């Protein structure tokens, strides 16, 4: 009935923590659905799951308001997620990183970085090999 739908909408309003939270999730995420929290990474992203939605909308992420040195309250990217939560969100597996932590290595990055194109941290190519032919340096002593 319409009454049930209105009650569900009011519950969604109350589920986000009042009015300010509802408005925040409406304006910076364009969706006000509520789902069970699965976990949170070290950057502030919150990952939610709701299996009642159809496939492709049953898992989502609310991005943090500040990642690394960039203010990401409005400017949110798809590259801001760490690799393990990236795999979980893209549904290559059914196991969240909290349940199945990734294997730890001494060379794996501890801090994740998003796309740095258009920024001073952007990648610039260069040749990684040494010079091929060495020239002959003339003697420093005059002959006459």
* Three-state secondary structure string covering the chain: CHHHHHHHHHHHHHHCCHHHHHHHHHHHHCCCCCCEEEEECCCCCEEEECCCCCCCCCEEEECCCEECCEECCCCCCCCCCCHHHHHHHCCCCCCCCCCCCCCCCCCCCCCCCCCCCCCCCCCCCCCCCCCCCCCCCCCCCCCC
Kindly state the smallest distance separating residue 133's Cβ from another protein, in Å: 15
Window contacting ligand CDL (CB under 6 A); options: 5-13, 70-78, 86-94, 101-109: 5-13
Kindly state the smallest distance separating residue 143's Cβ from another protein, in Å: 38
Q: Which of 26, 37, 65, 66 binds another protein (CB under 8 A)?
A: 26
List the single partner that 18 binds among ligand PLX, ligand CDL, another protein, none, CB under 5 to 8 Å by kind.
Answer: none
Window contacting ligand PLX (CB under 6 A); options: 23-31, 43-51, 81-89, 95-103: 23-31
């Amino acid at each position: 009935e319409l009454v049930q739908v209105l009650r569900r909408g009011l519950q969604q309003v109350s589920g986000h923590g009042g009015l300010r939270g509802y408005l925040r999730v409406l304006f910076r995420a364009n969706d006000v659905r509520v789902g069970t929290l699965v976990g949170e990474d070290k950057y502030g992203n919150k990952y939610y799951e709701d299996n009642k939605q159809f496939f492709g909308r049953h898992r989502w992420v609310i991005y943090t308001t500040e990642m690394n040195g960039r203010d990401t309250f409005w400017d949110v990217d798809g590259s801001m997620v760490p690799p393990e939560w990236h795999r979980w969100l893209h549904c290559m597996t059914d196991d969240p990183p909290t349940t199945k932590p990734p294997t730890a290595r001494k060379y794996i990055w501890t801090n994740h970085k998003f796309n740095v194109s258009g920024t001073p941290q952007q990648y610039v190519p260069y040749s990684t090999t040494r010079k091929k032919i060495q020239e002959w340096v003339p003697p420093s002593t005059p002959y006459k």
